[PDB]
């Protein structure tokens with residue numbers, strides 16, 4: 317599916333936007349929503365990366381880094397964009 | 402699947418989604434509609450799930466463009482349909 | 489069900505929920521509890537899933553009506569049950 321892998325990228329840009337101002341919880345919820353949308357597509361190589369990004373938020377952004385978790389979210393978004401093209 | 406037991410929580414979620422959509426909050430309303438969709442996948446039903454998915458895509462398209470009125474209208478229509486499905 | 493690193497995620501989400509409920513934000517606490525439920529249904533624990541659903545419904549019903557202390561108590565009991573399950 318190509319029309320449901322562009323909503324994931326649209327949420328992954330809000331996630332980074334929140335992560336750049338300390339909104340770790342809202343970014344967590346956005347990534348959870350993206351995982352929920354990715355569970356509905358036929359892709360089983362981008363859902364795992366989204367789960368990795370969510371766990372990255374949990375174990376890397378709540379401790380005050382906020383620079384590396386954003387990087388993991390950017391890597392996930394770039395992987396999804398590479399996949400849709 | 403739901404007789405104003407698990408189908409009335411969706412209405413209380415949609416109301417807060419509409420309230421969020423009013424002032425400026427597209428993202429919180431989107432998250433609320435996603436929660437309502439997650440609730441609707443458990444309480445059986447097929448029409449409510451589709452209408453809530455339509456409302457979610459409506460949030461995504463209309464709300465972030467700047468047309469909050471259209472997104473509020475679509476979520477209101479979905480809430481009214483869900484309310485008329487529990488009667 | 490999914491033991492550590494799957495249930496501690498739920499515990500941390502419940503801690504965030506309790507933090508939010510003490511300030512007055514019922515909608516964000518609702519969303520994070522829904523996220524914690526979504527983390528369940530994957531670990532394999534069913535009692536934990538049922539208690540998370542109980543906590544979600546409790547947060548809605550009793551905290552949207554201004555009784556935040558009792559909703560915080562219910563979420564604390566849910567978190568204590570999940571912690572007692574990982575040990």
Ligand SMILES: [Zn+2]
Pocket residue numbers: 344345348370501523524
């Ligand atoms: Zn989460």
Ligand SMILES: [Zn+2]
Pocket residue numbers: 327349431432435457
């Ligand atoms: Zn969404």
Ligand SMILES: [Zn+2]
Pocket residue numbers: 414436518519522544
């Ligand atoms: Zn909820």
